[model samples]
Target chain A: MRILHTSDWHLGQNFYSKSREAEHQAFLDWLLETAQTHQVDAIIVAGDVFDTGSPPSYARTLYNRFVVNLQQTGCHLVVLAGNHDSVATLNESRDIMAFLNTTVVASAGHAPQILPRRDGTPGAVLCPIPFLRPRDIITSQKQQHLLAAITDYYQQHYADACKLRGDQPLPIIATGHLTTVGASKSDAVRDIYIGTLDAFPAQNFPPADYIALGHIHRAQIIGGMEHVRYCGSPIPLSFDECGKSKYVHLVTFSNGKLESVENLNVPVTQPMAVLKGDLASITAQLEQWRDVSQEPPVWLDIEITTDEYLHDIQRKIQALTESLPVEVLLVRRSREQRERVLASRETLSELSVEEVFNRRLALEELDESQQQRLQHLFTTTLHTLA
Target chain B: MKILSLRLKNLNSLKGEWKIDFTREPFASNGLFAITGPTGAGKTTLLDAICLALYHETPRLSNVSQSQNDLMTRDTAECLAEVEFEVKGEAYRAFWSQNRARNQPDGNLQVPRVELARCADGKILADKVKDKLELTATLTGLDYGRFTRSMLLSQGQFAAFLNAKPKERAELLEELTGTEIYGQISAMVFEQHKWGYLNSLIGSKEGDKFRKFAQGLTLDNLVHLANQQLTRLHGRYLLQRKASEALEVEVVDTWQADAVRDTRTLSGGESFLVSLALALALSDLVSHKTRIDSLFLDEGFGTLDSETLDTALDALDALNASGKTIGVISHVEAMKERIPVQIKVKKINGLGYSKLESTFAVK
Candidate 1:
């Protein structure tokens, strides 16, 4: 059984107030084409189907259109909710989407779903877990024991899936939207754990044949384990995410066991460039830059490092980009001396609340365990107010 | 018309009676004054008061009358705004006042009163609320809508004008400054002009022949009109019609010995200049029919370069030469040297009230 695993679509995302509708449209078209060409039996969207709880009308249109179009390929689509997605929003169209061979596991308590091959026999059992908010797993007594409760919840679902499969030796696949103990993250990834916990230890996950995860925007295998993976966002969500190529994972199951996972690269619909240097060098670089063959204009983020304050840096960059087929989204400037100092020199407003608290806590005379306890307390208090 | 003084009672966070004497020493000598304050510090309320007294409506809050008056400060029984100004050597005072029934703060709001009177002999010119606004417009030569655009600009409007896309900017300029009449006149004149041009071309009045003859004449006229301003702006580039295409336009680079190039071939700065020239040309066409004397700019100078900044100030200086009173609202430090007199709205610490402060020129 072959399935396409992708996550973090973040549809209706307005990148620097510029619409990503065209890019998203192109992505969905390419995805549909890939699904047909690959002849996959199922496509699993791990989580984060929309950028916000309530997406714009065009985003809903794109989503519905994709689901309707996918019906021709005779493939099942499993869409789970991430931390960014609203359960109510996804579940609102659940019955309608289900009519079109799409399964929506929007809430945390949904039971495992069975994936069938074209022959109409059970091929695999899917523990389709959406993002588990604290409220989902935390009882009044188990408030402080969040990690244990979360692990128990996953284990319970895994046990249920195993029971549901009965004597069939089908591969058990589990999906999650969370931060692992050691996984790379990008600027666009919101902190799902906030103050309750830092990350879910990779060892705590159920021993599924394959673990598909979301939340982390960088595609990588967690804890050097090949089966447990993050497929990452299909497009560059931020300027910092521009350099790396994006991908969707293709998983194959053969002989009741997890086979190989292949990374299928998603094409860049809109090119993004980050130009960094002083005024003169950046000017020369911009003048020499050319992408005449590409149809879409490049979106640029220019960062200028200088000793002297330039009042008209934005206009100067704007003037340079006028004739070129490029849109300058951000023009950032930093003084040369400002970058060298590592700590204690930055203002309070420049630092995050956690960073400021951490720095302040560093001054106290306490043991490692004591410091950790205090830090956790501070985070919990801060989140309570927030 | 010059603004002499504005007096308002219980307007927004102003809380009590407050007055700005614009005819005083510093304001009278400097000819320009900045209205500076922190956000929500009643800085814009001063301008709103001026609008209410003269036109019964403000750019920020529209139609503050007896039906609903949100401008009145909370816990205040009544609110009033008065503006004393000189128009063509004749002083006039325009007043708008509203009060709750039985002079109670929480009572039902009563009908608002408005008056326009000559300041010289204290004789009331228009006492009725409806007639007061009409009389003020006649005396000031500006209605409420035009007054906001020409004399008192709202926030972010200038930024929108500067940053909007070319086609969008043209529509915005036309709508805000009432330059749509040019488009209307152009359409009417085109209908009349097309027939004469078509009649000469075909030498016959066949409907199909006339239609074909008049097909691209409007585009041709706009290109011609745009080129006139383009010559003044760059002199090198002359916007021209593409030879084969009816609506398509190309640029003639005079510096390259009249070499014609596609419109897309021009660089970004060149495109910006061309669009600006077209917009200016439209404004110039409108200026031929209307005279706008008072100008107020609300904070959009931060994004501009020093050269552009000087150019903009010089343009305003020219307008001032034509007997215009220009008021600029900005927090940019560079503006302090250029415009000496300033009506500073400073917030009282920890209180939701603000006060006005101004400088006086030494004798």
Candidate 2:
């Protein structure tokens, strides 16, 4: 069985108040055409089908229309909800989506789905786990307790999948929409269960043939494990996500064992540029930048590192790119500053909530683990109050 | 007022004459309809056409006059927008047109023409531009600004209202909903009575009553109306005024043992809910005099959570049930499934033109 793994579509996202509908449409069109060309058996979208629970109407049209069109390719689609997704919203059309050979796992606590081959044989067992809300898993607010609960949840699901694939040599592919230890993240990925648990340890995961993860936008193998990987977002979700190539993993299973994971690069429908330099250098680079084939102008985010405050910085950049095929979306000055320290004799107004807590915790003589635990508790309480 | 049909020529991406009959099968029957298409496919141009025909203006283009007429297609000499609408069972047609000298593509633009007439017998009620504007406003009970506030809720306005400073937000509410009367009344009452007389009139012994004297009643009424919608969208949070800070608002979190927190501390989703509530309340306040029958919401539904989105749609559904024709313009995919009737604007590949499609017809 072969499957295309992609995640974090973030459809209907208004990037810097500009509509991303055209870019998203181009990506979807390219995706469908690519899937057909590749002849993949199934497509698994790990999470974050939308930027928000309530997506724009056209985004919904794109999603629904894609699902319907994908049926022509005879490939099954498994959609998992991410942190940005609303379970109720994704599940609203669950029954109808099922009719079109789409399996939507909007919430957790569901059994693994068995993806069949083109010949109707049980090709693989997919443990499609969605983003697990802390409230849904355990009653305890303790960090360790929550961590253990998540690990146990995965183990239980893996065991169930193993039982389902008894005797047959079918690969068990697990999916999750949570941060794992050593995974690279971009600005676009919202922290899930922020203070209580930062990232899940990769070692604790079930020994599935392959583990597809979401939540992280920068694609990489977790903990140097070849079997565990993230395909990242198909398109750049944020300005920081630029420069890095986006991909959707193509996983091939030969003789019921993991064969090779290929990275299929998604072409940039809209070019994005981040220029960081002094005004002169930036303007020089801007002058040389030219792309006649680009339909819409390139979106630019510029950062100037000059000490002198230039009040006409925006106008300067605007003038530079006036006749060029580039639109300056954001302009900022990068100021050099000393790292904030909760120094002794500091005024109360100078101290932030987290800084104060950290300073107070430093007074206590405790082990590293204990310090981390106390810090997590303090952060959780601070979030609760705010 | 209900839009029966819209006819336009050479407007924006829509190069040629196009007509959409809302009185047809799908649009006539459906209470909620969507204007959907790719970005820059001219979905909003449809709303612009309606606004142009009625008010000779649109929110995007304030006034399409002789000085600048960007509404006309690039290579076209003339542009026209005509709308046939119904008010209190009486049919009327409002027409607006602008053309170049000699109707040539490259000729200089001439003075625009506008007319409002009774549709039944083609009897012109107003032929001049200013007269047409006055007659339409008198017929619909909404001028350009009021019409935008009550009938067409455009994008970014809700966020602006939400993030505005206390004084600015109050000014916006008063300006949009015409609630300045309450502010005037409060000031008049304060000016009319002295300390002792004011105490006797209000029956309050508080020294801090002065702080609540101006714009207090109007704020209270708005908060009360907004809270009704807030409860439906987000049951856990109740919006209330901060007693110490007159204009600053606080949220009462029902889930957190009735813990009251500043509006600034609310999450992104929570802020969206409050802003949407305020917008809906303002819409309700404005519609009190006009009894707005046609409402168009442009975007601004991308921030809600699944449950909150459902509640928001339910509220819109409720509004539709009250004899109103609702049009939603958004790119959200889920909205396509929820709203059945749709006027889809499709872009012609590689060409700078767009076409409209619906269940009954395509233009």
Candidate 3:
């Protein structure tokens, strides 16, 4: 089995004040070129090809075109959507796209689809685990389970699907759209939601020849097992991830044996990290590199020491060259500040029904107008009681 | 009593128009014509065309909302059906036209007339001539549905009529015998009982009165009260509205009613005995249809063997003594012995397209 494992292109993204469009394009161009060169039989996009769960319409258009190109290579595409994907929307292409030998796993609700052969025979049993954030899976009582309970329930479901093929030891390649526990993490802020930011445990996974994984930014394997690995993002979205931005893990299995595994980097474009003193350093650096590679893959992090706040971060980046879309994250050195005490009611004896309602409704910080009105009502009502 | 000629154009199979002229000696006045072919060879199509030309009924006949214009032949801007006849001693021609309502009234082709005719012999048309043809041909009289029962009863249809449940038989009998409106009143009574809010509309006093009054009373008293109200309102409501009742002839009561009516009920063959009795009774009320030239019984007797066919023929003879022809269309050789005047339809290209050959009865 030849597996071209890749994950997280995050198309239509701006990485930390840098444009990774070229970086992303380079990854796909290389994947197609490498798969053709390496003669890989199957290409796997593990998860999170888009940064957002609900990608925009143009993103879908680009993804669809990419899938068509993948089909032209006559390679099997086993796909699983990430936590950043709507399951139904991701797998919606199955009816038409399956004809091109593409398998998509968008939701945990369904068992992974098995490709049927020309003589109406069943091929490899594909188990696609999409980016399984608990919210994505745990919408109802049945799904509101911990990882152990979820995996155990899933194992039974997984085993039941295999039973339909009869009792036989077949080559099963299980792919997970996950952030596995053992995979290496290149320094980037992982989403806080994927279960206490812990690595995935390998024990729950079904015994298989190959385990494809995603969600972690790093492309590395489990310490002991050679078959298990994270096929990291095609383009890194953060400045901390400076090591390498583009590669597809190509693994080939010939009759239950791991024949070949290689990391094929995108040929045309490569990702670069640039650091500058203050905000101006970024522009000067871009001007110097204009001749060599005008469209250099850039992920920038700038620290500006300003007494007065500098507005137009995106505009400044664009003023340098407006062609690319950039992400803006600002670390500010403040120029002005203030503090005030929050209002509180002493007790029910000191307040009326309106005052009780005001306290209950005081979730947000109130202004002086809201403060004055309550004081007037309290004084007027209490005077009559006195 | 024969189809002297058939001019079919763009009627299902005979696309772009095809005509068969069978007006000649030995076949000119045959009462029976047999059309036989493998299924889908347009036999039903031929029947449809004849029904359209003569009776103004198309394939989708009982639909009041649709006009003849809807069955216009493709590629033609206008639709028409012209039938020439020699009725008694008068040689006359009759035809109707069709039109598109979207094209506005006058902008439409002369094809919109419902039933139009003019004398081919340069004679002035009779006043209210359309009414005369309707009265003469059994078209537009007491709804053609009754004509289907008392006159054109077929084996499968006739059997169904006999085997029907009494409730179903009652509905059919009501329509045939022109008592369908009274049955409607009975239905209204039963329906009123089902309504939760009907009590509200009638008021508790009225509803309770009906319930209590019905408990000690015979069905006759209840029926009498309802019919009295129905008759009072009939002038404007039921009659003006032309109540639609699709009641088939069913003999769920056949075993019971046939026992009371005895073997006399079995005279029209025991198959549809109840329906035949009800339909025969209905025929008396349908005085309008009895004036037609003849009733077309399309190949119905073949299902009844000889004895049943004879009984059925006898039933028709007794029912309509107007001396008008009772034309039988069939392939059963058994008909040759029973029906003095017979016509046979031989397959030309297909089922519906058949050669007409018949021997006339010497007066």
Candidate 4:
């Protein structure tokens, strides 16, 4: 059996606060071609198909269209819910998906039996365990402790699957969407996993031929076990994930045993950079990168430092960036500006009241009319009851 | 905000140019100070300079027939007052210059600019009065009403609350401490009830949009929802007010405490104490948003008896030890010995001048 593994498409995500529709479309198109060219028998997307649980209409359109297109390749599709994928949302079209050789197991359940192919022989057995909420386990088992609830849930499911298989020497695969003890989490991934179940230790998982995992964005094998793998997010979700290569994994089971596993690189959709320094140097840095290639403009996260306050700061930075082949994704006044304002040491004994008030207000960075309004308010209130 | 220095030119009895560095030696190092001088000797003028420089008016002159403009020396053509102070650890300077209605050399009213400027990094950030004053308020985070009533409580100004009508006092305090949110919530709840009636009058059930919306949130449903929200907000407010020590030292509500023996009938001294407690509570309210580490009392201590004075000083000491700087402007001669560090304004004979003699640390 030959299988391709990927997860965390996050199709509706607004990267850099802008739609990543084209990137997702390109990824799906490439994936369809890759699966066909590789002649893979089955494909597993171990959850988080959409960026948000309540995705936009267009996101639903893109997702449905992709699943239908993948069906044309005759590759078996198996999907499970990740922490980001709501079980209720994923189960909405479950019956429709099952008809198109797609198995969407939204919650922990019995392993799906692969139908006989043209040769009239059953293929590999897949045990799909979707993201189990801690509440689900605690309530179902009447278990109070989280660790015990989770362990019993998995242990029972694995035993049931073994009974269901019943002496067939077919390759058994288990799927999961969870955090293991050892995995790297990238930027904003922490924000999405709100109170996720504690990391499931490697020993807790069912003893399957291969344990496919999701939830973390970076691709790595857990606990030094090659068969236990996470096929990270297909695209960089945040600026912190920039410069690192992304990939999808391919696992081959030959002669009733796991044979080989390899990774195919994901193409970079758009380049991103985080630059910091004084305004002049950062602008100059952008200028140097203007003629790099025929790629889209670089998305920049610029942090600028200066001793003086810059008026119309956003427009100022955007103007410099727009002139070059770059987009100012964000421009922030550095902490150094606040530090310089506070760090000044006025010879207090030699200073005048006017000088002190003037300097302090300037350090506060107040605008013209606001200061005038305060003056007006002060004068009015002083004479109010006097 | 703490006063760092003060300078005045052609103002009041202190004629010509005068600059007093409030941050000099012992005065700068210590948290307490007394400003003293004989009657009409520019003792109050020193305090006036601080108010004028920051707020562009002398609060002491708010009721007097003579306005801030008249505080300028009699024969001077132009007058200026400047103050340098720190707010929440940031330094600032403010300048106010107004020319007396003087004729220019060309027989035209000179109208010397009463310009204001804020300085930072030893350079003028803004020279316009509008810009300077705005910056001052933003940094200090206190308007004139709050500033005067809390930090610079001038003599009879402390009695203003005592003299106010009972209901009027509550209204004033509610405005001061931002407790009007309760009234706002009440208004919103009433508005929600009005909406329920309007829905019936307009036959809202006939509309398709209204039907769909009403499936989950009907007019009556929303009225209850609004009431719930208002109740939650008021409950939170009650909790916050109790925690803030708004009433007496141990009182939760005024009804259960000795603090409320009919506020309208309290004695002058008791009213003063209540006003003092309210001021501290108001400070707690403001401190949630921005820090204020300096306070000034112009002459309120004169009204306090020895036992009360000791309590007030103890409160002031506690505040100072917690990093607040307190300055008192008074004619209370005993402060000269008790305060240890003093900003003395001395009459310069009959020269129409008052000098800042010295600010020293006494043994």
Candidate 5:
């Protein structure tokens, strides 16, 4: 049995005030090809299927169309609610999508859901855990510490799933949407920990053979433990997330013993870079891309470290990129740093007259020979005064 | 500041194309050299060509102010001069061209244009003339008047400077050295000193101060104090303030070894030596602000005798030692023996054209 793990599509993201329809469509098309090539049995999305609670109509249409098209890949699909998704909204399509062989995990109502193997073999069993709000776990309104309540809620759920399996000799896998103490998140994700102040530690997790995680956009293994891992977002969501390669995990199993977990990298559709230099160098860099008739245009964020107050800076940058296969998304200015030194009686009181003149001499732009001549004049004046 | 090379076509007595590499062996071997030629051998026209290439106006024709195009060669369609020079360490080129109107009844009329460019490895630094001019100004720190006057002195003009009286000396000094601001501020200081002295006398302790005592006074009191103060200050201030009177400068007659009311009494050779001193002094003043690597003396030493000429040559030799390229143009035959490195210009007999020959001094 093979399982492909991925998460956080964020279909309705607007980048640089422009719709990311082309990039998202390319990513989806690529994902479909990867799934068919891997020939996986099951696919699980951890959380955050939508960028917001209520996306636009076009985003909803894209979401529905993607789920229907994914069915043709001959793999069972499973999705859960993230902090960005409204539970009721995602659950409305629950029963309807189940008829199409897709499992939707919204509310933690009665029991943990199980995805059975289709090959008549004892494969891995996955228990889906959605984003748990504070009200979902806290039974008492007067409970001040929600961290304890959330930990109790996860332990109870995992314990119930294990007990119901009744020693079936199958690999038990679970999915989660919350952050762990050691995981790194991108700047795009807001804090979804409702009442808890910090992330749950790795020790608080249930004893599942492998835990597929999400909500953190950077792919990493939690606490250096291979069993718990996050397959980060398939495409970069912000310029801050640039240069981080995204992936989807492929888990292979032999008699449900959890053979190995392999990560497959996704191809970048649009690239990004951060540039820092003066205007001439930046223009020279942009000039290199003018004849790049080969690939997708790169987006650049420029930081200018010059003291010149160019009156027509915007026009200059626009002219530079006018014929280039590049875009300047942001320009930041840094002021030039100059050091000034002067001494009054308060500070000069401790120094000799020659020392004071030496300090002043250092501030002026003079060569070595000129400095020696000025020093001689200074010494002669001091002697004449005495 | 230094001419590396020059090329000219159809200008004055030079009919076809002519080229000179001033950086080559014979002409460049010595710091001070002579460009000796016979009368009407186009030596003056060579200097005229250089001044035209740099400033688009010749020293001999700058006062016409009528946009006259007399620089082109007669009976020729076009005249051009190109110069490659170096100021500081930067290389520059100046090109000037004048074209006579084709098929015109009158053959002497022409139109002129100029171009200046900064170059390295034979590439233009800018395409715009304004930008090139700005760069030239920044590099040389001199305009046309200062350049022609100090960098290249005209023929026999230094003698006129030697004979200038006190008032004329002050005006000539202001013009040559661009020290008009000193004179303007000097008068301001004199007026300010008088005002300060008057204020001191008119004002004193508490109620006895002049401004305080004259609170209700009108023009009558003002005039009364003016008359009294004028008489009281004439003797004391005149004696004490004689130092400021020294601002009125006079030229001392170097021949008589004394200050003179007029330098017209100087002999021809004496005036030439004094003229040489004043020219060197003016060049020094200019060097304090802008460096002039080359100096031109155009047939100006012909009036001096052998002794005076030797003195003048020694002064020029001193200038050369201090880093200056002296270009002397004269028709005198004795200069060929005195200066070993020479640009010898000779008239082609009956051809109305001249040819140049470079000769090194035989040790």
Candidate 6:
């Protein structure tokens, strides 16, 4: 029985403020047709189904269309509501829906619903946990450092359950949206997302075949964890994320052992290209790229930098073929503000003066508070002057 | 209060002459009888013949072939059916036959004789007929539609009609009552903004959270009141269900325009119920219009739950009253014991022709 593992559709996600409903719906239609063509047994959607907790009516229209498509083919669907989903609304009568060959496990007030594929049929136990806000799981924490250990805790829980239930080898795939220690980020996914950074330990979830993680807009493998991976959002969240590939994960489990894994990139609604360099180089690349751009519609974000800001830089980018949609994220040429260097001093007053005052003067900040709050620089300033 | 005999020609699968001895074999007593047959067994044809002979009416939803010529006998100019019965201790006859010239049917039938015993003459005397007298003078004084409508119930039709929309279901009930109860209910549902707007708000919390919240609250109260009425209805139905039974069904999906656009129009299972409901509603219409004294039903009750079937059967029992006899038809043995008196049709020749046999209950 082959199974298709995919999720985090974010059905109504937009580029800036504009709605991408048509493109999203088209993609969903394609996805349904693809799943059918593939003859997949179980279509597992990890989480974050809708772009937001409350999407438009069309969003549900698209969702139901997809659901019907699946149900028509007689394929089984297992959907667990993600953090973006309102569990109560998304999963009103789960038991009844399950009877229709589609199962939805969305519960916040209860423990993870364990549906018994417990008979150990090469079928992996699906653990779909959406983004974990520390407060959602626990009421309070005494030690700030123990927050990171929380990941280790859940990891162990999953590992323990798998080993205990399936000495017969039941592969485990955990679907979560989180920021692990070495996860790549994109601007769209609520940057600086609120969560204890080290909350989930990768090793804690041993014996787990794979952990399909979301929320970090860019897809990347977790540091030192071969099994934990993120498929990333379908579109580039920001100019910082322009060049990163957006794809969905295809994982095959053979008798509870992960047999093969692949990341298949989906077609884009708008083309995303990153142009990172000083003004002259980026301007030159943009000129060349504009010649081959598709017309009538598309999106692009060009990163431009210069010693003196280019006048009407956005207008300049737009002028290069008005039909090509583009956003020029200005990367200001302010490198001196990049890194801090300490000053050697003997006393608190001297240290303060040398550490901050020195850099404030050199950085040429107009803000008085910024100037005052700069690290000590008395000794370093005088020595440099001499 | 019984049909002595029936004859069929050129209708549905009966392309030529066919006949059934309703009085001699199927029954000797005034009790319920059934016509047991499988799909495509011409059970519906039998019903059509009965309707046309007595009331000059053919089923609105007749399954006649495209070639009108194919519907009548190959040798005969027009198709005909006749019913011989005893009315008020006198022998009478009712006749019907096709009239292709105007595409109209001849249903102006007659009770040809006033003899105390069976008569042999075939000629019907002109100007000697009494339309009003034959209706009441018959042992079973039920009209054409009501009589046949009371007798015949189709299989899977119960499940379909039960699963049909509220308006459709109401129409059937209205026909049973000979009133516009369902018609009014349908009109009310259609005219009321609450029916559409109410479901709109209750769609999902994602759209209008506040409206969804309010509507969700109202749905409970509506169900509660409906439940109370349903309880009373259920009790009343049990008493009425002895003569005939019906099958009721609920769906896994709700009807909506959004559902239509997003998904398929309706599931096969759902379609089954709606169609069944429509058939029932039609039966009711005919029952009232023709004043039928006998009915013939052909269907299976496998798709419905026992409770749902119980309610539907109860409703059918009420319709089956007024001394109009009923005839059930199905291959499912589950109903054989339920509607005990029946006519069992068995295939005889390999050429697809079949013979019908009858059985009687001891009681």
Predicted structure with the largest TM-score when compared to the true one: 2
DockQ of each: 0.01, 0.02, 0.01, 0.01, 0.00, 0.00
Q: Candidate 1: which stretches are off by over 4 Å? A: A141-144, A290-293, A334-342, A345-386, B1-363
List, residue by residue over A221-292, the lDDT tens digit for candidate 6: 776666777776665555566543767666656776777666767676655565655666766766655555
Strongest candidate by lDDT:
2
What lDDT does model 4 reach?
0.60
Accuracy of chain B in candidate 2 (TM-score): 0.73
DockQ of 6: 0.00
Candidate 1 at residue A100, lDDT? Answer: 87
Q: Write down the lDDT of every candidate, Cα atoms only.
A: 0.68, 0.72, 0.47, 0.60, 0.62, 0.48
- lDDT at position B118, candidate 5: 71
How well does candidate 3 score on lDDT at residue B116?
38
User: How many clashing pairs per prediction, in order?
Assistant: 3, 13, 20, 25, 0, 58
Report the C-alpha lDDT of model 1 over B1-363, residue by residue, as the tens digit.
567788888888777678867655555543545777667777677777887888787766766766778889888899888988776667888888989988888988877877888986989899887788778766665566555544456665442222333444233233333323223322332344433421233223323332222223333444566665564444457776566523456787643324578766765445545644443333322222233334456655665544344334333332211223556776655455344456777787956776665332111
**What tens digits encode model 3's per-residue C-alpha lDDT throughout B1-363?**
223344555444434344444454322333333344333444445555545565566535443123334455444444455555444444455454454545443334453354434445574343233563564354233234443444445434653333444454443333222322222322343444444322332224322322221221212222223222222211111101011232222112211111122212343334333343333332222221122343444444444544344334433433221323334344554334333333333446543433332331111
Where model 5 places Cα greater than 4 Å from the true spot, the runs are A120-122, A141-144, A194-196, A305-311, A332-386, B1-363
* Residue ranges of candidate 4 with Cα displaced over 4 Å: A110-112, A115-120, A140-144, A190-198, A305-312, A333-386, B1-363
lDDT of 4 by residue, B193-228 (tens): 433422332123323222222111111222232222
Error of 6 at A171 (Å): 2.5
Interface RMSD of 2: 22.5
By DockQ thresholds, what CAPRI class is model 6? incorrect
Which pairs of residues clash in candidate 5, taking residues 3 or more apart in a chain or in different chains? Answer: none
Q: Is the docking of candidate 3 incorrect, acceptable, medium or high quality?
A: incorrect
Write candidate 1's Cα lDDT for A47-99 as tens digits.
98988655779999999899989988899999999877767767888888888
Summarize candidate 2's per-residue lDDT along B25-126 as a digit string, tens digits. Answer: 666554568888878888778888888888888777876888788778887889989889887778998888998988788878888877788977989899
Which numbered prediction scores highest in DockQ against the true structure?
A: 2
Model 1 accuracy (lDDT, Cα): 0.68
The TM-scores, chain A only, for the candidates as listed are 0.85, 0.86, 0.66, 0.79, 0.79, 0.73
